[PDB]
Amino acid sequence: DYRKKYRKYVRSRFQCISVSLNKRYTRLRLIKEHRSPIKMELLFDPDDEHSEPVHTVVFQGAAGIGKTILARKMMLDWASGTLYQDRFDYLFYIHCREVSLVTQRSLGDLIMSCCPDPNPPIHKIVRKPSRILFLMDGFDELQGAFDEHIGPLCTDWQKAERGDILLSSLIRKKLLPEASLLITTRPVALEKLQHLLDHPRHVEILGFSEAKRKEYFFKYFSDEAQARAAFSLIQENEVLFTMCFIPLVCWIVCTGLKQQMESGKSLAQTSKTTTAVYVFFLSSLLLCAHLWGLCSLAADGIWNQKILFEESDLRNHGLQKADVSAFLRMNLFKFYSFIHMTFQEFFAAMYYLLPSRDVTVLLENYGKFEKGYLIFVVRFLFGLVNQERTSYLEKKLSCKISQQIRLELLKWIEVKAKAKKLQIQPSQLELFYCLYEMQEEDFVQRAMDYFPKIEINLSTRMDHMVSSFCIENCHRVESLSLGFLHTSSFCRGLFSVLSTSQSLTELDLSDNSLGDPGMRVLCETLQHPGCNIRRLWLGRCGLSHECCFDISLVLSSNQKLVELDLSDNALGDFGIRLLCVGLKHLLCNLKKLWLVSCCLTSACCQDLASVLSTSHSLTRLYVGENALGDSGVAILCEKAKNPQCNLQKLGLVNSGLTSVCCSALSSVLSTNQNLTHLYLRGNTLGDKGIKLLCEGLLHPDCKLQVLELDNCNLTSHCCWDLSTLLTSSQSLRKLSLGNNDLGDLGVMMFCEVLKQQSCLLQNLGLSEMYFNYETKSALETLQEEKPELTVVFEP
Amino acid sequence: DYRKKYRKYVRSRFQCISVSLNKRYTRLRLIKEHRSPIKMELLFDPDDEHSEPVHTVVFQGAAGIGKTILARKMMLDWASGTLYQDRFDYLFYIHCREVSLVTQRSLGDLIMSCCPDPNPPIHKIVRKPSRILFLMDGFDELQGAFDEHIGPLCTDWQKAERGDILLSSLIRKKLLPEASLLITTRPVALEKLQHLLDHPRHVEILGFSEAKRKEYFFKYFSDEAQARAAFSLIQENEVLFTMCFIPLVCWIVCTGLKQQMESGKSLAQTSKTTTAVYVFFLSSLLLCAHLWGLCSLAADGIWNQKILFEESDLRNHGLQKADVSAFLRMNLFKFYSFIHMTFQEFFAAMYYLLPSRDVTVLLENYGKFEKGYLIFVVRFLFGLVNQERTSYLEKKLSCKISQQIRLELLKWIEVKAKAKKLQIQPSQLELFYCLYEMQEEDFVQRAMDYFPKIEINLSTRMDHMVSSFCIENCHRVESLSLGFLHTSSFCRGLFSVLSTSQSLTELDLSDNSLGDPGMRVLCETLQHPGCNIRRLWLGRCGLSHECCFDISLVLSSNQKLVELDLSDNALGDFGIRLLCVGLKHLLCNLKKLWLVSCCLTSACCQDLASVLSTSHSLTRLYVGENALGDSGVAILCEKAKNPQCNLQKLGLVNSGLTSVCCSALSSVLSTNQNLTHLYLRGNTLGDKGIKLLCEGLLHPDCKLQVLELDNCNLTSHCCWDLSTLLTSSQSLRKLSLGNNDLGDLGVMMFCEVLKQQSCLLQNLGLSEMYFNYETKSALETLQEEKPELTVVFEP
Ligand SMILES: CC(C)(O)c1coc(S(=O)(=O)NC(=O)Nc2c3c(cc4c2CCC4)C=CC3)c1
Ligand SMILES: CC(C)(O)c1coc(S(=O)(=O)NC(=O)Nc2c3c(cc4c2CCC4)C=CC3)c1
Ligand SMILES: Nc1ncnc2c1ncn2[C@@H]1O[C@H](COP(=O)(O)OP(=O)(O)O)[C@@H](O)[C@H]1O
Ligand SMILES: Nc1ncnc2c1ncn2[C@@H]1O[C@H](COP(=O)(O)OP(=O)(O)O)[C@@H](O)[C@H]1O
């Protein structure tokens, strides 16, 4: 059968990368991304049979993380008899470097290119569209492929179409919808796919763990003692060991070490950044005319989208056949390419330091993946313009480089930081990569003074290290938002430089899986004498009652903390009991406290009240969305009635309240001169509860200014009472009353009351309340009648 | 309800054929045809629910086998309440004789023609397309219906289309796809219809068995004594009783006997062939002007495709209304037709002996069914041109006939036999039918001298008799291939005339269900002193160890047998033990023996070796595809090392071998001067095994010439060893090495070795081995460098 012939063909083709792929291969860390380990067998398997088409799978990875090697290993395993031997007919390796937009070819012609025979049985293949898979590797082919509106989609596979249109039709499941796809791509090209996909399954590639680094370093060196020595020399440099999570850096450093050892020379060289790694690799593998030819060749390829280089183009750039080095890898189809596109990048940067030679036009034109790649370009550029590496590079390669380009890059980063450009293109972490690449402290200080509001999302150890370096070097940061993915080991490094910073005032960690150990580390950090953090948000950090002990320690030790948030954490009654110990200290200067939806009950209300009568600083307390109950609110109000209480804003939204507690609240309104705001949204107070409250709001000593009563189940019966409030309350300024069936007569009474000049009110919230056209017209008459009084009643 | 009205209509219409159909009907033999008894209820039922339009059923039968009667009986049974009273709404009797291509009508028009009412509820019928059956009887209507490219297919049953296009749309399931079909057809019309079908279910009609012949002979004659007398008179004629498997011949002979008995005359007339039957029927039912008119009418109908004759056409051929005979059946729609199309055939032939009158133009124009029918034409013509029947026919009917037409038919068969025309039109058995029809020993002997390579398939006793007659009368047959369908009863007669032949040398019976009794009969045949068979192939004949006893008897008795093949038969160790008794006899001249996939083990290897050291004639032994093992191969080799052993070619393909036995093989290569070939494909010898073998092939006394090592699990490590062979082996000429991962360095070493003039090798098989373009180009440069050395490396 031709099936076994094709299997043997792909097994022979993908056996080596020569060196054996099976010997070379090391397992990578694969994790599912989209949330409401992973194996390939279950990867193509549907998690839910109800799910819309599973067979679309997108692999996400950095440059050199091993997407191509992963796809080739999948083909090798499938051919060798390991992956889906149950039933899955064919796998087609569409290497997007070969695919070009200008050429007009059909799917049959593409399979012809992927088949070993000049006349494979294509019709039999098409007869089984459900058993066909396409490994689309490297969606990073060129620019302008999809930035325009997609033209007509082709379903007739015999028809010849352009590369872009054919790929769009294949991806969008219009051409052979039953065919399966697996696309290895970049995050920006991931955004492009998300603009061209419908329910795909996303899988991330992380690379090598420490054990996998052991495995790779043992597999590379044929001699076990040599491998042990090389890895031992790697160990004492933490930067290299952290960077080695990417297999490409492992390969480069192993090649350098092997070549130096074959020459019998010292292996002790160390590279601070990626640029230093590449520079030492080139120096080991390295006349100036040949360097200029290579640089111009790379620049031409970058500008004109040409990755596979022909002999004519090679000749155009002043390079002879005798100039072929170990950098260019050959593929006879006669074509030359680079080992990885990052090398073409590095040589293009070297060109820009040694195609237009102005960096401004390079920076202006962005699009598709290449923008980040062009930023990746400047990344190596950022590395090369350094007071240390430039001198040694010029000495080694006998070259000359200027430094106005560094000032131009500084202007570019200034513009990028000051530019708002939210949620557009790679924004924050990549700039930190560039700054860490340069490693010039003075430039870093001059460059990060434009950042202050910093928001980053970290997923790898290298991300943690670069963020730590940048935040430590910064001196004008005020607000800092951290996101964590897939912790405490590198949190111990981040939080130290967060504490040492003398300009930070905010610290947002909401919506993370910080956990109890992470919160313990953060609290150990916050106890530092030099800490300056004044606001700390911890919403939905997955915390429990265990973190409250450490938070209480911080509150009893830290005199600068002013605001704190703990919303959506299951602290519980015991958590609040632990927290109130710190809250009652004399060194606790906390002013605002959020406890919305902390799974509290009426039991903890005895503790919080003790804080209100004792805390000399706590003014604004929000305890909404908790089953406090009428008894709990009564317990709070029993201590809140004291005129010495400093409480100003109180939040009881959706706190499961009835009218029974309202009288107690009224007492506070009669006695507390400090309570200016009070939110009661979502509580079924009722008309009797509103009357009991108005008994207190009408008191001469009441100083309330804002009151919310949304969704309080208020009918027309109470509409008179509030009217009596409006003419009499000399302090109330705002009042929200949405989500009620007050009725048209009630709003008529309100409008009749408000036309007087004796009302000091300035806002009424009647949104989500539906009224007939006469009432609406009355409200417009009122709203342009009284400009200072605002009513919201939009339909 | 109109359903019951139409049921009553068809029940009344199909009650008689007058005589009652139920009284007349006799059960026919029905069998499924396509392979990887049958009853109509399961025949419409799907064997597998996964099977694709099961509802399409095609019936295959000879002329007069009873396809029309079977369809009419099915319709009568369905109307009477016997076939699918569960649920199946309508069956429509589309008699293809009525359907014409010129007339343009719709499906509703056809149903109206098949309906008794001028305005049937057609829309209600279309509303239930899954409960509609179309019974297309006689797909052999006319010529040119489908020989051209099929035009556009019509799906709108309202639209009027031509007969050919409408039938194509209906059959191809484009017009009412949910409708079921049942087509009765001819084998050549089967070919054409299968060129218009997609997964149909084929059912073959065989006719009457001996019990069914008894039943029909009792049913026809109303008097039991008369029926017994007629059957007793018929039975003593063996040829007539064999031809009686066709119901039409039974009807003709019964009508003749009944008419002769009514006239009180003798019934002793005997007919050797079908032509004699028809001639005696004519004599019983039979002025010369009327005969010429009938003959011209039949010829005109044959040439212009007109089966239903009008009175205008009747007058056109000099036939008056007073000339209406007992043959022409009338159908008032006013139309005349023949009893069967075979009668129109016979009268067209009679015209050709008594429209163009040249037989050459008759023979040239063939197509559709009619070609065979036209051959059917000449079949009766072949009967009529005889030294015996012609004189009696001329005396009876007062006619004159010439004999140059016989010479023209002889030239036609000369051309047909000389013409290659493989797998095109009716080729071999039908010519035998014509020759048996003529019954002239001189003409048959002169005509069969150009047959020699005969390949025929037999399914009925009539086929056995005609083939036996033709083979017995032949004198220049060399090769003879027999196929059997659905045995020994007529094999006992066929094999006798096979043995008596003094020119036969080969006898191929591969892929039959010959079985042990059949092989016993064949062995009794082969022991005849006059047998001349020299090669006997018996692959996959379903043989077992029981036939080996008889084969050993033959080998000990038959001294002319030279080659014998027993591949794919479960002979087993005991079978080989029985065979080796005959193989070791002094009168056994067998030279070549095949035992591929005979379910052998290492146990039988002790016996085969005893043959090698004893058999003075066995030179080529093939025992591949058996689980012989290393021990078995060692047992063979320890006897094959003998210098006096005459073994030349040894086959061990896929014999489950390892390197352990290879050394033993090496010893044979060092000792046996006669071993010139050795096939080891599929055995995991390995590089160590290849080295052990090359220890032997490099011996000065080794005389091997061809060696195969495909799929031997050979890596690059052994590539040096074979190279040492190439420069040193002075006898090897061929070497095959496909299905290996030899590597590019290995083929480079081979090419470097081969460019020397000292290499006597002439062939290397590197197919299915995949190499890069440099290795490819080197391979061509070598192949045009050395024209005498051929390498196969096609991609
Ligand atoms: C900011 C974010 C999320 O890390 C990102 C955005 O875009 C990309 S990437 O797709 O450009 N790939 C890379 O940067 N790979 C890459 C990395 C390092 C070192 C090297 C490479 C390539 C060779 C040396 C160290 C971390 C990533 C990554
Ligand atoms: C070679 C092969 C397989 O027997 C064949 C090929 O084509 C056809 S047939 O379809 O032309 N039908 C017939 O010959 N019927 C037929 C036969 C006999 C006698 C008569 C008839 C018709 C009336 C008398 C004796 C055997 C067949 C048959
Ligand atoms: N599983 C692995 N084992 C060993 N090396 C790997 C592995 N995956 C990737 N590499 C290294 O990565 C380099 C190629 O990376 P590549 O697959 O091109 O990354 P990408 O697909 O993201 O461009 C190779 O030099 C190879 O040594
Ligand atoms: N089951 C049967 N019982 C009795 N006679 C039959 C039967 N089937 C066919 N015949 C005979 O065959 C003749 C018609 O054959 P027909 O059905 O037209 O063959 P085909 O359908 O192959 O043309 C009739 O004269 C009838 O006597």
Short mmCIF file of C-alpha atoms in Angstrom, two decimals, chain B residues 23 41 118 176 346 374 396-397 417 432 455 522 525 529 539 541 586 636 653-654 707:
data_model
loop_
_atom_site.label_atom_id
_atom_site.label_comp_id
_atom_site.label_asym_id
_atom_site.label_seq_id
_atom_site.Cartn_x
_atom_site.Cartn_y
_atom_site.Cartn_z
CA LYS B 23 -49.43 -23.12 -11.22
CA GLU B 41 -36.82 -10.88 1.96
CA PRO B 118 -55.50 8.33 -16.18
CA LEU B 176 -35.56 10.44 -6.47
CA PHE B 346 -32.86 -17.35 -34.88
CA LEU B 374 -24.93 -10.52 -32.28
CA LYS B 396 -38.46 -29.70 -44.65
CA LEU B 397 -38.86 -26.00 -45.54
CA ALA B 417 -8.12 -15.96 -31.66
CA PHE B 432 -16.65 -22.73 -27.45
CA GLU B 455 -8.27 -19.53 -20.01
CA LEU B 522 -7.21 -34.83 -10.52
CA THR B 525 -6.45 -38.33 -13.84
CA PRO B 529 -0.30 -43.43 -19.00
CA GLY B 539 -1.91 -22.15 -5.46
CA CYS B 541 -6.72 -24.54 -3.92
CA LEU B 586 13.13 -43.29 -8.00
CA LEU B 636 18.16 -27.90 5.70
CA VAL B 653 11.68 -15.16 1.96
CA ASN B 654 10.07 -14.05 5.24
CA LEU B 707 21.25 -12.68 -3.87
#
